[PDB]
Amino acid sequence: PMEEEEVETFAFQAEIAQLMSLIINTFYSNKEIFLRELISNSSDALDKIRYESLTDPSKLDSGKELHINLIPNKQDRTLTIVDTGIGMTKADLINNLGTIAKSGTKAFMEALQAGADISMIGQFGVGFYSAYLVAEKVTVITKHNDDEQYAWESSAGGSFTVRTDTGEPMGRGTKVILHLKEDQTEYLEERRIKEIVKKHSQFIGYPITLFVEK
Ligand SMILES: COc1c(C)cnc(Cn2cnc3c(Cl)nc(N)nc32)c1C
Ligand SMILES: [Mg+2]
Ligand SMILES: [Mg+2]
Numbered sequence: 634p635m636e637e638e639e640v641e642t643f644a645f646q647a648e649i650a651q652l653m654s655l656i657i658n659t660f661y662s663n664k665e666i667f668l669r670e671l672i673s674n675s676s677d678a679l680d681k682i683r684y685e686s687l688t689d690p691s692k693l694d695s696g697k698e699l700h701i702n703l704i705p706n707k708q709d710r711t712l713t714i715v716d717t718g719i720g721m722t723k724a725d726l727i728n729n730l731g732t733i734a735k736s737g738t739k740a741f742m743e744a745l746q747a748g749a750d751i752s753m754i755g756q757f758g759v760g761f762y763s764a765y766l767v768a769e770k771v772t773v774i775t776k777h778n779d780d781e782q783y784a785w786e787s788s789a790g791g792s793f794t795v796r797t798d799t800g801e802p803m804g805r806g807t808k809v810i811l812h813l814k815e816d817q818t819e820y821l822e823e824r825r826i827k828e829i830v831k832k833h834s835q836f837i838g839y840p841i842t843l844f845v846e847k
Contacts, residue, residue: 640796646731648738649762650791655742656765657789659751664767664817665829666752670760671714671809672834672841675701678718678807679839685719695778695805701837703830704844705821710813712820716839717806720777726785726795734759765789767820770812776803 635642645653679699686692696717704713721730737757744753754760764771773785782802787793811820819825823845830841 640794642792642794643727644792645787646735646738648735648742649731649759650789652738652742652759653762653765653789655745656751656762661751661766663750663752665820666754666833667763667766668714668820668826668829669833670755670763672701672830672837673755674761675714675716675718675807676837676839678716678720680718682717682719682805692778695776700840700842702842702844703826705823705826705846707818707821707846710818710821712811712813712826714809714811715806717804720780720805720807721773721775721783721785722777722780723783723795725777726773726775726783764809764811767813767817768811769814772810772812774798774800774803774808774810776805776807778805 644650679701682692683699699717702715704715705711706713737759741754741757741759744757745751751763751766754763770786770788774782775785776782782798784796784798785793813820820829823843826843830843834841
């Protein structure tokens with residue numbers, strides 16, 4: 634039907650849709666780097682809210698805790714990365730994030746078509762899109778102090794959606810929910826997540842807590 638006035642559909646910027654298709658279809662085995670890139674993004678988000686609060690302590694009224702949580706769910710086949718950083722506004726989700734990423738995306742594609750491999754995506758500032766190395770659908774729940782709670786979602790293919798979230802309020806931060814591909818379930822294992830974290834994302838300025846399944 635798609636007669637839901639609460640859900641809006643947008644097309645990715647041409648360069649970004651291209652990058653996503655390239656990431657999805659390239660044969661690349663070193664997929665674990667996706668978790669490092671997302672943990673780096675959360676650390677950046679937490680640095681920003683911590684820095685803003687030095688001049689305005691009321692920015693932490695929405696939560697003093699500053700941490701990162703990793704939550705595998707074997708039943709739903711999802712790996713969720715939660716942080717209490719600055720969050721994202723509606724403008725960020727629709728306009729600003731893609732605009733700021735245009736230049737880095739183009740450059741990254743040149744590097745790839747030259748020699749560089751996918752693991753350097755973070756050097757171009759577009760590491761988030763490495764999530765689709767392992768995820769067929771990505772759902773992002775976010776809350777910025779200056780806006781409402783929103784839900785961003787995309788299964789690639791050139792389009793993404795944005796709606797006002799109706800679920801549990803978070804207070805402030807971001808939840809990245811990775812709906813994992815059938816053959817990428819190794820990233821729901823506790824020993825595997827530990828290895829990847831200790832490898833790269835290890836000197837992070839905030840506590841990283843792994844939720845073990847029951
Ligand atoms: C909506 O999904 C994203 C898109 C399409 C592009 N980049 C980022 C990374 N990213 C940007 N700001 C972010 C903040 Cl405040 N936090 C986190 N954890 N990631 C962020 C995200 C999450
Ligand atoms: Mg595609
Ligand atoms: Mg906690």
